[PDB]
Symmetry: D2
Subunit: 498 residues, 4 copies
């Protein structure tokens, strides 16, 4: 029997585990330490959650190691491992309303969006990777023959072993799912650290692994702080791989820690300052719709959000007025209400960063066209914001907001290479976009953009089959697609002579 | 007009450049600093070589950056890049005797081995990767369609940009070639740091890039110290990837430096303590030949050398008897003499280390069967050495010698799981081998060995098509094979809506 | 509602459709023509089944074509096509006892075997290929650029369209599933011609596609004769691909008919005369068990059955003695009885062929050790048969029996190339096998066998992930594995200049 | 010594072999039978060429079988096979002016074009496929394990054996090269039948394989008639694969002959009636330039030639004006004059068909804008022709001219699906094109065109890396690219239990 926090909301009775998940069991932290998780819609405490300590990380890694080395997970067929992951996706789908509600409460995710993306995409993720398990293939290789003898060379794809996954708070279930699905499909076991401020879908996911029949110790979940739990994962001598999504500075420190312990493999998705170039020959009304999506989707708490929009001089003014007209129509409110378009920011500290961000933008001389402030109501709501007259030297031209802030610069009519130069003048390279009806421009611009993803006449179009990862200081390695599996596999070369 | 050190030796005239190679020209280091390179056959000075300084590193990187961003290398067809690399291999072949002789002088490589391996495998490497240039392909992916609209998703494989390559001294030209061929085939430009003690084939290779018509700036070579030149390459904001081969300790430091600068990609090949398991049911004569090769090849200065032999108890004495008989037959001497089959160790400090290594082995209780000492002749020759009665706790059972030292333990007849457990009891995971005529044991043992390469009834059988890299603290990433290209490429996802 | 033949048997109530399945409905053939399907355990009529006519084929193809061009199947995401095929596998699993019972009645398949293989492997097949739908990917290719312009080249993997599947009677549901799963996973629609003698699991499968939600017209099933139905499919101008399994002479005629109509694509699996080579150094008791399986699995009605065993002279007599002991332990009876391990032959005309086959074997001079005859009982049972002293010139050394007839030849001790030569002296090349504990022999023999599949120290080990198809007159193209998808896809190359 | 026809021409002394090439020797046909090859520039006899008989085909196939089974070609490393094919490409390059002059003489290929395309692409083809030899790789597959035992499954890619290649007369050397390079890269041996009317570059090519060191019997060339030589190749019991390019009717007959002999593999490229769709929003002057190339390239003797141009109503009349202006500037004459744009048709019978084709187009009501008859001058020149007011039911809208005849229909402005319907209403499916600056039209149109190749904003842009082959009655299988290799390889599955 599992201890729950029960809550009746959204016409459901939520049953939320709140303890550490280690070796198939929900257990209190060492010395029963806990912390509060906060609802961004009204600032209230949802419940108390176990606060993992160093000894708890060690118990989790030990359980993951045992599950990998001696447990059923390491012995079953690749095809049966896949069956378990498909059953897990089915169990998640049976609980999708509940998971989406927990996400609305814990993260401020608009409920209708959370069904489709936060939860719906996580289900797609497990189903996609489940189908990879028995389709992961090595090679046979036509090497030179040590005549008069013969040689056969093959490669074997093998699991890396115990992995640590450290994730951020913007899409708690979905980020967990991206990495976990690929990690488990490859035959590994895992210790997951959700962001401290958003542990609840992760703990509910953990209970779902029990319903799906995932062997004990395969998945272990440790709510708690990065500087304690995350740090110990990256230092642990039995952990062989870290998968990380978060900030550039923490990513640096994680890679350092992987280096100084046991040269564990690492992949890093480190956010960005993604440019969107909008030419005068685009479909303007579509560009407004997609341009706004690029910035405001999931209240701007979106790794690939367009952090700058460059708009061609001759449509710039019409583009801005049309955006303001559409911004006025956005319904801000409780994420659980079906008419809500724009939910609260994830947590209070982040809201404060956003207020300070927009003060600095006004200070340095950009034109505030709308928004810029906390919305007057309970919780942590921020008004959808539009800046124009942004210049390349400005702080808001360089720094990632991670909030609903459209940062617009103009470019001269016909100025393709000049605008690309401005778009590429960043140490980030996560995403980018271009809107234009002209095929020659669309193709040339996507070639020249220095980003891991280029959207053409769309934005936010991710898919579980399409690899997602950054260039330069946005990190390296892919989540999603076949490419993601390579992070979680090792290649063994076997050469016979006969 | 290039300055050479000219030397008549081995029935040819060596013309050795000795300066830094930057932006397609040979140039002195800052303040014209130099150092001496030493011939391990007699301890004599071969010549003075430029000693690269930090500002030379910045010059090399800026030439590489400019070659990549604006030069012909970034504009030519992939197929034409391939033609230049195939022409480079042909120029290397035209100079194969000269290169092999430089290698014999600088590194102590036995000339007939150097022609076949050091040089011959380098020519194969460039020809292999030249064929990859126009066969590097991305994907088209069947993503969910944003109905009523359509979506097309593709991936583009793109070069990463300026790369830094830092290599060790055991196979100077061949290590350089493994990494450089894959690096250039992917369309990157490169700054290479050869080990300080062995710069000469690298600088001759650099001259050959001019004869092959490789555009200036594409290849830049900086003889000099790792603590200075290597460090600055790992720290440089314009370098996007480091490929490194060397010690675990330096690899940790490079990975750390990659993190703390700009999260540059890194691959690491870090050596190991590779076990070779010899069962009683093998062909014993062939096991002696291959077992000796596994230790003594290239005077044991060999990343994948077997660092422990486990020999089934019922054949252990007869195996050791036969090994001793063959060691007595080895001809130790000048690497340029055609009768020589064991040349000098690469440099004096390494010779000292081996003497000390064998002292510790005797001290801790291992039976010295033969060798153990410097050979009483000029230069840095070390005796082919056999230890028996080696126990798992011994220092020589855990530490990598990188010298011609066969380290033998017994295992009981019928043991398989017990010896595997002892063979896998290391934080390294580079290579391994198993000799047996039994199919079931061969397959089972290769499955169970925790190493990047498993040889079955052979050893040292590398091939340019077969990926090579370690597990655990032997690092990550591959050299050789199609898999090596992935270290040198980035994946851009492009998603259209139409 | 659907019309069923109801039958209480095996502690179940069977509900068997018996009509044509066209455009999502069971319908009578033109003129309400029918034929009888025969239970091979007693020779009784199971029921009457619609007898498809030419006008019915034209309707099936029309329904398939509409379903492809205008129906839902042609519009849904690949991922959703995959979900439907997974759902199909789940429905087949929910009905596995019933499907296994129908196969016992219709094909004489021993129920416990049918559950595990005929049905169990069919379920695996649909789940395997369901996983492929959203992982079928084309390429982007680094072509030469028409300077000063640029070029992009990609390939798209597309369905072929309407396919005809013509299958034999030995594994009615399983053969249907192999081809249909790959065909549908690639996005095609299908008209299936089951062998006239075994229509019933196919018709039940048809009903299960309704339960799974497969759009109408995607799967169409036409019980009837090959000379009428099969021939029209192969002639039809709207069918773009035929997948065929059966005899070499019908395969040739199908391929000719594909040629003369509209150059439709064709794949052919044409049976064989598969050699199994048993060396004296194998595990002998295992060789007896695996050797028995290679011949007697599914009453020898097995495309990959070993049609010749070559046994090394020093173990021959002992092998034969041990085989006869095991053959005597075989329980011949009703496939529905749990103790049965050898069921009846599929139908009467095949039983007649087996009797004549053995008559000719005795006539030409082989020694009949046991069997060779119809068992004295109702139905069409054939006694497990062993021949020894078979010479290469004999009819039974050359021609496929497709019955439970073990055909044994000796080869001299130490021969390898001589036995390989005899094993390869056939126009067939479907499967083959080798038993030996010697790694060098196993690898060498597998290299030299001219067959699509080589089993090493096992036999009948097929897997849904492992491609299966023949060389030479055994045909071309693969079922199972990623390779199977290629028979059902076309590649479009798209080249842009910009 | 080799017998040559010597000819002083184009500043060279051509040395042209004229005999059969069998087993590395040039030999007369049976009974010293010969035929005349005709210069299409003036109708003169170039020389007499051996006329292969049935007994000559059997000798060529015997030489190829022995070369494959017992000769060096079947024994060398894949990498060494690649080196020989690279060297062959280099020998062809050394003789490129000579080969291009022979092509001018024998096929009427314009010399400047023959250098760049007929010969230049043939050289690229060998170099591309030479790079594939050591990169052809099979798989290791994660099958279910027969517990308590283990299983390993791998695939091996192997050559098919003796192949026959039957080619047409439009690009004699280039079609030979496409097929032969992929065939040989995969490790096969080959018997080539050049079109009877154009044997000379093939026989010169054969001599070049001797200079390149291709082992004797690997390549065999038999000039002679399709109905005798080509027929015997497709009937031969030792030929395992036919690669064919030519007409649909011959291709059907070839495929039928493959069926009835020994089920040999077959690939077919059968020409087309390829539509080029030109929208009003294209770059019009470039549309005219590319539209002209699409038709008139290589005097229309081009299997991917646009056989219908659909031009949007609002630009139709201007398009046709510009075309007539460009056609009047075309220089018609001797293929050796360096200003010739338009050479003679390949041979007399083809010229006569072109005259009848144009009579038929006029008779059925199409408007002849220019040309339509034989240029008055010696040889077989045909006037570059333009037809407008072409309607869908017309013979010239359905049938391939294979000549310099632009066949233009309008389509209504703003229609897209309707023009697609008309473009797709053919049983052919080889190539197609679309000219438009609109990205959404380009992508949608390329998706909907039922053709193996779609060109966007270009035409005739083939590349040795980009697979080329038809859909529907244009045949199946690819030439060029990695995909071509699969026609020439077979897959062996090897499954171990241990
Ligand atoms: O084998 P073995 O040579 O013993 O292995 P090592 O790891 O000692 O050396 C491998 C290579 O790494 C270089 N290196 C050493 N320190 C650094 C550093 N701080 N940053 C970058 N590169 C460095 C070395 O330079 P060096 O030639 O100076 O040793 C050498 O070229």
């Amino acid at each position: 029997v599992i201890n729950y926090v029960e809550k009746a909301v959204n016409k459901l009775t939520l049953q939320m585990p709140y303890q550490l998940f280690i070796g198939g069991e929900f257990v209190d932290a060492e010395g029963s330490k806990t912390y509060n998780t906060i609802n961004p819609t009204d600032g209230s405490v949802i419940c108390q959650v176990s606060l993992a300590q160093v000894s708890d990380v060690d118990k989790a890694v030990a359980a993951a190691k045992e599950a990998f080395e001696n447990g059923l997970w390491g012995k079953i067929n690749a095809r049966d491992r896949g069956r378990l992951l498909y059953r897990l996706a089915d169990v998640m789908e049976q609980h999708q309303e509940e998971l989406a509600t927990i996400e609305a409460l814990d993260a401020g995710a608009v409920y209708t969006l959370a069904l489709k993306t936060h939860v719906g995409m996580s289900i797609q993720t497990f189903r996609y990777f489940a189908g990879w398990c028995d389709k992961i293939q090595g090679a046979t290789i036509p090497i030179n023959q040590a005549r008069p003898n013969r040689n056969l060379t093959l490669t074997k794809k093998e699991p890396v072993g115990v992995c640590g996954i450290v994730i951020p708070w913007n899409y708690p279930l979905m980020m967990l799912s991206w990495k976990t699905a690929a990690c488990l499909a490859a035959g590994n076991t895992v210790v997951i650290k959700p962001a401290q401020v958003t542990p609840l879908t992760a703990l509910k996911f953990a209970e779902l692994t029990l319903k799906a029949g995932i062997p004990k110790g395969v998945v272990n979940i440790l709510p708690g702080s990065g500087s304690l739990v995350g740090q110990r994962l990256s230092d642990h001598p039995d952990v062989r791989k870290i998968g990380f999504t978060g900030s550039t500075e923490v990513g640096k420190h994680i890679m350092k820690s992987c280096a100084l312990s046991n040269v564990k493999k690492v992949s890093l998705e480190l956010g960005g300052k993604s440019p969107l170039i909008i030419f005068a020959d685009c479909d303007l009304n579509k560009a407004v719709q997609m341009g706004m999506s690029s910035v405001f989707f999931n209240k701007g708490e979106n790794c690939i959000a367009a952090g700058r929009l460059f708009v061609e001089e001759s449509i710039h003014n019409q583009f801005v007025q049309k955006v303001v007209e559409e911004v006025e129509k956005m319904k801000i409110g409780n994420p659980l209400e079906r008419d809500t378009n724009h939910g609260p920011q994830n947590h209070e500290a982040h809201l404060r960063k956003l207020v300070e961000y927009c003060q600095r933008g006004v200070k340095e001389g950009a034109t505030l066209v709308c928004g810029g402030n906390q919305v007057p109501r309970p919780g942590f709501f921020f008004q959808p914001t539009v800046f124009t007259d942004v210049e390349d030297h400005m702080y808001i031209a360089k720094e990632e907001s991670f909030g609903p802030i459209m940062i617009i610069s103009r470019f001269a009519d016909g100025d393709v290479d000049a605008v690309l130069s401005r778009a590429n003048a960043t140490e980030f390279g996560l995403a980018s976009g271009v809107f234009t009806r002209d095929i020659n421009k669309a193709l040339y611009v996507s070639d020249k953009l220095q980003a891991g993803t280029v959207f053409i006449n769309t934005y936010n179009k991710t898919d579980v089959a399409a690899p997602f990862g950054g260039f330069k200081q946005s990190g390296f390695g892919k989540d999603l697609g076949e490419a993601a599996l390579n992070e979680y596999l090792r290649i063994k070369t076997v050469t016979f002579e006969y």
